[PDB]
Amino acid sequence: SPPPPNAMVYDRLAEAVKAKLRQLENPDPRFLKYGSPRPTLTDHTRILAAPETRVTTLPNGLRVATESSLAARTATVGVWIDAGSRFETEESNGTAHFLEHMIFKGTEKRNARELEEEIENMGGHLNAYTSREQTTYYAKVADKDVPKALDILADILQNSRFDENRISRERDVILREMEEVEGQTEEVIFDHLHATAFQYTPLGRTILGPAQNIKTITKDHLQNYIQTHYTAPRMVIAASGAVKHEDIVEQVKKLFTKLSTDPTTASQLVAKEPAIFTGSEVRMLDDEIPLAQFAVAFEGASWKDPDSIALMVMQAMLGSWNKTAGGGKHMGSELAQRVGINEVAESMMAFNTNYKDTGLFGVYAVAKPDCLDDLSYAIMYETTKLAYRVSDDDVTRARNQLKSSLLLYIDGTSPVAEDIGRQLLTYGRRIPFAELFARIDAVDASTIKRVANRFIYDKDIAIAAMGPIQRLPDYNWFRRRTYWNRY
């Protein structure tokens, strides 16, 4: 008279959990042959072949670089300039961004409607973006319109006209472009972080400028900016796709003949006004906003610094977690396991910015106002641990991830050409794929601790925060936790 093991609902719901678990016990050894969860370091030399990059310096100082792939049917060609927001004077602070929007509107040969129609009749595109140190103008076309595309970029950079009916109608496009980027809150955190870390230096200003500068800017200002900065040693013509190097050189030798001739380089302008880091903070409390956002940053490395590659391996150790991600509680990074297991944030991200003389290294996070204590403990605990205790599987995995993310990003004709043009401006050369992989795996566990002791250990920080941030710890709490009084 014991009940049989199918008679009660709770007894036969328990023989069905034991049968679900007996199919997790006999693994198939032919599905386990190549994959391994332990990271190793491997050699990628057989697959790293590429076409040749050919650089040619014209006698005025202009450089022309190409990577030809003659089996394609498209192309990308553009101009990279060594100028930006840093090289202005606070009475001309929005000028390099205003000049970007006023350069597709001029020309004595083709007006605004004619220029807009020549591009769309071909089926092409024409873009532009500004930053604090670099400007770009480039075009995506088909392979038979490359001489027409290069004809437009030379004429809109040399012979543009800026009339008053067009200037004043751009003052209301930009004054309404300001108002939308006052509501993205990741570009607002990172813009107050630059103004407090690099205060009283030219690197602390914003790109769009103050709103009083925009309603004052007139053509003269636009014309002295384009005669002081857009000069031949500070410009790179880069092309990629179905192009030929010797045919592009003869086109630019007769099209670019009339640009200015000032012999001031960019390095004479960085050296007479350098950038200096200051430990400080900004806090904007509102309490009607539901989520809080903040960033904490150390000073980092410049472009040509040999320690720059180790601050990119370290950024891949801190990692990234989001609430929609499929990794979940199982990620490699230990900062992402702390955030993920306890649910103490909405999202977390580590950043690393390089400049000509300085840089920034840190973490950005979004969270609910009752989680800010346990989140700030976990961020500071794992950054300071890089100066003390570094595992060997942590750096092998973070080297395999940085090798893969730098090359999976170069996919198509336009990622290739912005790789050529941006690297000739920062390093003076394009680094081949086999040297770049050789500098990455020369970063072992002892290299991590030595760069962490130079940049992180017992150093000043900069914080910018916004929202319901009354429970975020103060500056002395953060400054104290850059070292460990234990050991």
């Binding site: 003390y388 205790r389 570094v390 595992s391 566990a445 601790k449 050991y487």
Partner: peptide, 29 residues
């Protein structure tokens, strides 16, 4: 790493001997 953890941690054993005879001079032992 983990060696440097203990390669630190056994000299606080000895920072504590510079300290353990600092006031008492435990003599006979």
């Amino acid at each position: 790493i983990q060696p440097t953890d203990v390669k630190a941690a056994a000299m606080w054993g000895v920072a504590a001997a510079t300290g353990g005879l600092y006031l008492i001079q435990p003599w006979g032992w």
